[PDB]
Amino acid sequence: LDPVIQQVLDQLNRMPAPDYKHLSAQQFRSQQSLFPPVKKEPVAEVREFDMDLPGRTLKVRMYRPEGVEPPYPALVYYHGGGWVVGDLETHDPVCRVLAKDGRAVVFSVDYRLAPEHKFPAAVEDAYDALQWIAERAADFHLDPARIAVGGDSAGGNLAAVTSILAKERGGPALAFQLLIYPSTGYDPAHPPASIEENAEGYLLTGGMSLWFLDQYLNSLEELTHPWFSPVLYPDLSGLPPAYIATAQYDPLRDVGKLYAEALNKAGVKVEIENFEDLIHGFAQFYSLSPGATKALVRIAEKLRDALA
């Protein structure tokens, strides 16, 4: 059998067989993905509802993993996608793993996208969503002292910024920040080595990166706006401990490293690990690539330990 497919099959075949005798069309459509076949870890409960915010309503999909007792630790998650693409479905498989393996209730936030909603729309949504969810901790039986923020790529940037805004605003309390190959920014004058090193051939290219910025940002001066490039924020001290994952063949590899450095220098506990054989956005290859699969689960387990 074709090797690549056989790998995907192995992942699907090891999971519990569905009870097709009592499976609704709605369950099949949400629990199974065939285009392409991507494994969706089963969770105990999946709820989707609106967050009525000033000027806009954001949808949120909440994943409660099986075998976890309340008060539950939680993760407010912001999907990647260059602030232009992605939604609740594109990262559904990722959130299911973070809930399942992270042993936490995940809240995937469907923040406004650019160019329709340019910077800093996503940033206000990220923070507001966190505030909306944390103040309703009881509604979801969450442990308010164990609410973390996280995201991949643009989402990791949003989670990083949200932590800073939360500090400046005096709340809500954030216990941890999970940054998956986050675009935490850098001094455009001195671009890290990975920028030019991995500018081509590895999915996220220099052209695509810059195209994302044209869609997201308003002015050239915003390239150094702390809510876009948090690594430039003056005082990173007091921020939630963090875990940063970078990919060897990611132009943003050193960008993540750079934020890890700033956090540590700022006295913030921070763990960072580079995945030697992966590219940017590797989480999207969950179950498709053995390396991406193992990497994401490890990441999920780091979240588990931090909120344990």
What's the CATH code of the domain at 243? 3.40.50.1820
Which 8-state DSSP code applies to residue 37?
Answer: B
Rounded (10°) CA dihedral 128, 131, 135, 139: 70
For helices 121-134 and 154-169, the axis angle rounded to 10 degrees is 60
Interatomic CA distance for residues 154 and 156, integer angstroms: 5
Comparing C-alpha atoms, which of 245, 246, 247, 252 is closest to residue 208? 252
- As for how many domains the chain has, the answer is 1
Task: List phi, psi (to 5°) of 30.
Answer: -95, -30
Rg (CA), the chain: 18
Quick check: helix, strand or coil at residue 272? strand
Contact 186, 224 (CB under 8 A): no
Contact 107, 74 (CB under 8 A): yes
List the alpha helices (DSSP H) in 135-235.
Answer: 154-169, 193-197, 206-216
Task: Identify any residues that bridge with 47 across adjacent strands, giving them in sequence order.
Answer: 62
Q: Quickly tell me which residue has 């097709």 as its tokens.
A: 20
Task: List phi, psi (to 5°) of 70.
Answer: -80, 160
Tokens encoding 159: 């989670």
Comparing C-alpha atoms, which of 66, 22, 5 is closest to residue 41? 66
- Residues in the chain, overall count: 308
Query: Which domain does 38 fall in, by range?
Result: 1-308
H or E element at residue 104: none
Tokens encoding 240: 């939630």
Interatomic CA distance for residues 235 and 151, integer angstroms: 22
Contact 15, 39 (CB under 8 A): yes
Residues marked as catalytic:
153, 250, 280
Interatomic CA distance for residues 153 and 122, integer angstroms: 13
Tokens encoding 133: 């969810």
Interatomic CA distance for residues 120 and 255, integer angstroms: 20
